[PDB]
Amino acid sequence: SVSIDVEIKQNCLIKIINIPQGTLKAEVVLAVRHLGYEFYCDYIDENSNQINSNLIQQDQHPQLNDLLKEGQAMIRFQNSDEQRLAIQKLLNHNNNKLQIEIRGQICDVISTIPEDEEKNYWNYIKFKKN
């Protein structure tokens, strides 16, 4: 009803991988949104990533595409309940890992963003944009 305080959204955040060649965040957004909502989505590559050694991958050795550009997209809804709604849809008959094809390409989508990530992304965008 009414709260003297204010609270942000939790479920309204998610992460997706399998970045399609060239395909920008627009196609990632268009694919996700077409579902059931209009939620602000932004794509971002790994943050301050380290570096790898040439192109070789031992047993516990880093991979070549360490500090690669464009790899996953972030999506934010104006409501947690909504985000959920969009979730319950993709859910389907059984749980399993959500999957979506964006811009005619198959990309992996995860509807779970922990506090660490919520705060990171929120503040991130609020830091890059503000």
**How many CA within 13 A on the CB side of residue 105?**
15
Three-state SS string over the chain comes to CCCCCCCCCCCCEEEEECCCCCCCHHHHHHHHHCCCCCCCEEECCCCCCCCCCCCCCCCCCCCCCCCCCCCCEEEECCCHHHHHHHHHHHHCCCCCCCEEEECCEEEEEECCCCHHHHHHHHHHHHHHCC
Closest by Cα among 37, 41, 47 to 25? 41
After what residues is the chain interrupted, C–N > 2.5 A?
none
Q: Which amino acid is at 20?
A: P
Cβ atoms of 103 and 72 closer than 8 Å:
no
Cβ atoms of 83 and 13 closer than 8 Å:
yes
Range of the structural domain that residue 63 is part of: 1-130
Method: NMR
How many domains are contained in the chain? 1
